[PDB]
Design a protein around this ligand. Structure first.
Ligand SMILES: *[C@@H]1O[C@H](CO[C@H]2O[C@@H](C)[C@@H](O)[C@@H](O)[C@@H]2O)[C@@H](O)[C@H](O)[C@H]1NC(C)=O
Ligand SMILES: *[C@@H]1O[C@H](CO[C@H]2O[C@@H](C)[C@@H](O)[C@@H](O)[C@@H]2O)[C@@H](O)[C@H](O)[C@H]1NC(C)=O
Ligand SMILES: CCC(=O)OC[C@@H](COP(=O)(O)OCC[N+](C)(C)C)OC(=O)CC
Ligand SMILES: CCC(=O)OC[C@@H](COP(=O)(O)OCC[N+](C)(C)C)OC(=O)CC
Ligand SMILES: CCC(=O)OC[C@H](COP(=O)(O)OCC[N+](C)(C)C)OC(=O)CC
Ligand SMILES: *[C@@H]1O[C@H](CO)[C@@H](O)[C@H](O)[C@H]1NC(C)=O
Ligand SMILES: *[C@@H]1O[C@H](CO)[C@@H](O)[C@H](O)[C@H]1NC(C)=O
Ligand SMILES: *[C@@H]1O[C@H](CO)[C@@H](O)[C@H](O)[C@H]1NC(C)=O
Ligand SMILES: *[C@@H]1O[C@H](CO)[C@@H](O)[C@H](O)[C@H]1NC(C)=O
Ligand SMILES: *[C@@H]1O[C@H](CO)[C@@H](O)[C@H](O)[C@H]1NC(C)=O
Ligand SMILES: *[C@@H]1O[C@H](CO)[C@@H](O)[C@H](O)[C@H]1NC(C)=O
Lengths: 443, 440, 444
């Protein structure tokens, strides 16, 4: 039992059209995941007692997605062919006037594709030193196309709506147990009265913008940066498509930021390169579950989308109404014993460090702990028995040694969170790909 | 009537010693249109007094921060190629050319206060390129920018979101007044006081955003963080401090580096830009736009933007009644709800609009949820039949989703079904510019 | 006294485990935090005995502590280079050698430079040939370039984001003694006192708004806010386009530092060469956002370390009070205050905003609340017995501000005119050009 009640009152409710019903009313807080109000009720005018438990099972924010695109890993492949001045297409203005969608006759053997591709021409040296009788600039013709490095894609998306669901477990007067789902300003009729989410203060808060990646059949990941609305070089989605299949085939309908392919002309040699963000590196770094500002992001039931779970404290008021019954008393909290187990993770990182505790109690409650200056907060569930419970904290030193005071009933006792965390070196998701061209013999 | 009451108590208050006994009711705002019906009993006397409190709207006002003007810019250039050892084309000059130096090739060009730059690109020499001298020739270029359209756009961020909760209060005699309350504010009435005692209204979510004003044509949202300095490939890569400066493409405007591209072709030359079209950005996000159940729209008078909570509202009101306490409260009445239509897109920021036919016998709130609770609908119910709409976000083209609804708490099914359109991946970059005017 | 009472009743609490049956009867009071300086004055009466005692509860501060995530060091860097042009067929200037040059290949032209652990790169640019460029052969000459970076100033800056914002509500509680104690509450927390317990039963405090931001630490010189999202990797045109894992690595421009592609521009001029950078000046960024800074009524300041967000006006939290064997008898009434507009200093259309100051005359401790006509501007400031000045940040969009406020501490509002002149802040570019002409090496 948890101490959850904030207020208790009697209310008369009349049906205007004219019957009147008298109800006892209790304003309780959800408190935290696992918290449970134990209520014994007394009849208002009659001498009867009833029993009722209301338990906070979970607090979830469902991500309703907005804009979405597919991306992946890409790499360039080059065809090259240099002609002397006055040979082939290498006359006067042609090379310098070349268009990205004009294919040189040097590459006629190439059939038409539906692939992301471009064409270039670079003036090179002339004269004997470059195998030409003519001294004017020779023409290095280049045809390039993109290919998927691996035959799998990633779907990147933003979250526009975070829809709250507060799941409650209610043990009614008859002892029957039901699950009640409540949204914002929602009220549910029960056989003993009603229960309503009368004030909801749950929501995504903080100073960071973020988005998510779906890896088909391999889960989700968080991107700790704002969603990129258009293709931009140096950003995730600098190459993007409208389908999973178009990423795999590097289809021409994909969008890409300007100038993503580099060229290094070397007379008869030529390197075509890219320096793209590796989205799979991004995915592995932010692989769910991830916790940010006490919100745990993970895949929903059936891997349909992402959700933010509260695993500890919950900020929601619940108004209970009991027909013809009012509060006699509430169940008292019981103490719990907590022992530090381990601390694992990194410091100065978004993911943070995982602290695990062993919790022993004789009833369902909530462990609440804090460091001295109150900069750190631990909130974990307790029950009749002994379970390990973990959560994420964020530190900024390698050698952590911080004392906490904890309790489930208000009688605080010391607990030392001690461990070694690792550093994460500054990183760069860009990876060079590509290389020398395939040299075509002159025709 | 709505069941909004959370707590009821009898509180005595003492000044300094005069003491006043007031009935005290803690009610939830609930949602827009929700109305608390309170019959009071004389604490001292033997009178019954009726009182109604209705939530009319809940607005967050955007107090703006940094702001700039921008537009749709385009390049126009002059070019002139000279042979080596001719004119300025000597030794080091072309490779050493500075952006702010106008070539003597364009000595006929007057003074300017427009954004401009200058380049010199070496080109082929020798007989094949019309020069006796075999050394590299010099293609000089003078480029300035201009505004395509004769209109500009002001981009800005929002630093403060200031809450206003507007209440409609019905006195004992049936007199109706309107009260506005901000955070932690109270207001005296002729029957006591109403105060916003706990406010959980605010802008929450996983996205940062900004806004654009189009003078006399309304506002738009920008579903991306405000760009603090000029950056290539972002809105405001070119920006000015005024509207008039955008139209003249004045030299005081800022530019990110290297926004103008050059393609020298011996005697031909193209100067091009590939800039974000802010007008396209504007049209995509033109208000009203709804994000995380916040409806963003122009404030009345068309003076800045506001966020309206058109459905659910999270705020506690504390009511005090002088010498009166709560006798009873009006019961909620049930309503009938039927699906009307569903219009919009899927996997898009704007979302889709759902409309319901709602019939009831009194003022109240309709609440709905799909099976897994990932979708939520909150809409006002009234006596009679009225249409009500709200924005939802989906990720499939064919929607078929059963909702359970109630106004009184007794749930009934309802089917939201319709077809949503796709929005293809887009790029706001638009190519502009072209060939130069060739001198001589 | 403040009017903070929201509910009041008796609650009986009992052990239900079957061991020790101890039922305690408590009075219970649900109060709003209201704002900084808000103080509930509670006269309690005995529940089992004929006794009275006075109790006060005052909201002292509401702090959100930044638990940092990813972090990096940066600074202002500058390019320095050596250049040496060789004619075609001379030295390394053969076939396609110049066009094939790799960033990490030092030219033989610069064999004299010692071992280096500094950020550096090498280039080769083809230049003119023939007798006009001092060469016998007409194929392109080779301008070889070796470039290294250096830090201008001997300072560095640490840029970081905030992942967690841990709330702490501090209260001053005056017992029946007159004795005052300070208590700290986190979310859904309870603290026992000698008269019962106080618990933060509903917490509506948090970082809200439409902007993402991060922070900069200047070692021994405070912090700053950056009104833009943290950049996770080096990107040209952004803070952190060059970043390091330590302060000293910034100062030495160490090779372990990361940088975005092509941050060094080159201007080949036959035997002259300019190597330049146009990097974001992080010290300019720091100065613009120097703490304290107020955003959406949140005052960001140093912890005194790390950064915190203070709610100095309104505070949105409910507190649940339990009194052992005591219940609420009555509460102290709020008092009127009179406000006088002092001054208004700052800028318009800017993230920093403008600071308004009032002089608030009252007869007791409370809270002043005000609003302009359309309710787009809100003012919440602490009130005290006497005449005292108080200030807060507002945000405007005009150089000449004219706003009429209706203020109150009890509920009956009176007019108040706010009038001032705010400066404009022109659009800015944090980029600064650096570097210049190469040191020209003589051939060997
Ligand atoms: C609490 O559970 C008691 C039995 O649970 C036992 O389970 C074991 C796994 C181990 O944890 C033992 O220490 C436990 O005692 C049961 O006998 C009690 O009745 C329960 N207590 C309450 C208050 O329900
Ligand atoms: C409540 O509604 C009653 C019925 O509404 C009428 O108006 C029509 C528009 C349509 O809804 C029909 O059902 C009805 O003829 C009306 O008679 C009552 O006066 C209304 N009462 C109040 C208090 O609004
Ligand atoms: C028949 C004479 C001859 O063979 O000399 C060369 C040709 C032009 O050569 P090309 O462009 O056909 O192929 C060059 C091979 N490569 C790429 C290895 C350099 O004639 C000229 O010198 C220019 C007219
Ligand atoms: C008298 C020397 C002469 O006139 O011919 C020049 C030399 C090559 O010159 P270099 O590369 O050794 O140095 C010149 C210094 N510079 C480029 C900075 C001006 O010979 C050739 O052209 C090919 C053998
Ligand atoms: C040819 C003249 C010099 O050329 P110009 O600079 O007067 O104009 C050239 C026009 N163009 C570039 C279109 C060909 O004498 C020479 O042959 C070089 C000295
Ligand atoms: C290339 O694009 C241009 C338009 O920019 C078009 O006119 C031309 O036909 C295209 N060429 C080919 C081969 O598709
Ligand atoms: C830490 O403790 C938890 C809880 O039992 C356990 O699951 C986990 O494996 C432990 N990790 C390490 C590294 O010991
Ligand atoms: C252009 O900029 C240079 C900077 O070196 C300056 O000396 C010069 O006065 C400016 N104006 C002109 C017309 O060159
Ligand atoms: C959907 O129904 C609403 C309410 O009647 C109406 O205003 C709107 O025009 C309808 N939409 C379409 C596309 O018919
Ligand atoms: C330069 O870097 C390449 C990889 O890009 C490496 O293979 C090569 O060994 C490096 N050369 C030197 C001299 O460090
Ligand atoms: C404005 O008044 C405050 C209150 O005393 C004072 O601290 C500040 O210096 C004043 N500033 C100006 C510019 O008058």
């Amino acid at each position: 039992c948890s101490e959850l009640i904030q207020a208790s009152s009697r209310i008369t409710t009349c049906s205007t059209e004219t019957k009147c019903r008298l109800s006892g009313t209790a304003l309780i807080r959800a408190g935290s995941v696992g918290a449970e109000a134990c209520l014994m009720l007394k009849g208002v005018k009659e001498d009867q007692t009833k029993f009722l438990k209301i338990k906070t099972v979970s607090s979830e924010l469902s991500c309703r997605e907005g804009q979405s695109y597919w991306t992946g890993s890409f790499s360039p492949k080059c065809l090259s062919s240099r002609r002397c001045h006055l040979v082939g297409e290498c006359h006067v203005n042609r090379c310098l006037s070349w268009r990205d969608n004009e294919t040189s006759a040097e590459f006629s053997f190439v059939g038409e594709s539906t692939t992301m591709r471009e064409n270039k021409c670079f003036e090179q040296c002339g004269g004997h030193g470059c195998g030409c009788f003519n001294v004017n600039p020779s023409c290095l013709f280049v045809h390039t196309y993109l290919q998927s490095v691996r035959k799998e894609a990633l779907r990147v998306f933003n979250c526009i709506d975070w829809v709250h669901k507060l799941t409650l477990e209610i043990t009614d007067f008859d002892g029957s147990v039901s699950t009640i789902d409540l949204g914002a300003s929602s009220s549910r009729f029960t056989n003993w009265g009603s229960v309503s989410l009368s004030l909801d203060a749950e929501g995504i808060s903080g100073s960071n913008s973020f988005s998510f990646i779906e890896s088909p059949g391999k889960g989700y990941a968080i991107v700790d940066e704002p969603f990129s609305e258009i293709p931009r070089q140096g950003f995730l989605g600098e190459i993007r498509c409208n389908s999973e299949s178009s990423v795999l085939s590097a289809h021409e309908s994909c969008l890409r930021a300007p100038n993503l392919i580099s060229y290094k002309p070397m007379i008869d040699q030529l390197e075509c390169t890219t320096n793209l963000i590796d989205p799979f590196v991004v995915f592995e770094r932010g692989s769910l579950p991830q916790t940010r500002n006490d919100k745990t992001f993970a895949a929903s039931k059936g891997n349909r989308g992402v959700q933010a779970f509260s695993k500890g404290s919950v900020q929601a008021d619940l108004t209970l109404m009991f027909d013809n019954f009012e509060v006699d008393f509430v169940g008292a909290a019981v103490s719990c014993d907590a022992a530090f187990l381990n601390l694992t993770g990194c410091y100065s990182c978004n993911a943070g460090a995982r602290v695990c505790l062993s919790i022993t109690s004789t009833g369902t409650g909530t462990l609440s702990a804090h460091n001295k200056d109150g900069s750190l907060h631990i909130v974990l569930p307790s029950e009749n028995g002994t379970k390990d419970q973990c959560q994420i904290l964020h530190f900024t030193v390698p050698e952590v040694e911080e004392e906490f005071m904890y309790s489930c009933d208000g009688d605080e006792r010391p607990l030392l969170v001690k461990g070694t965390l690792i550093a994460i070196d500054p990183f760069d998701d860009r990876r060079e790909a590509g290389g020398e061209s395939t040299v075509v013999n002159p025709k």
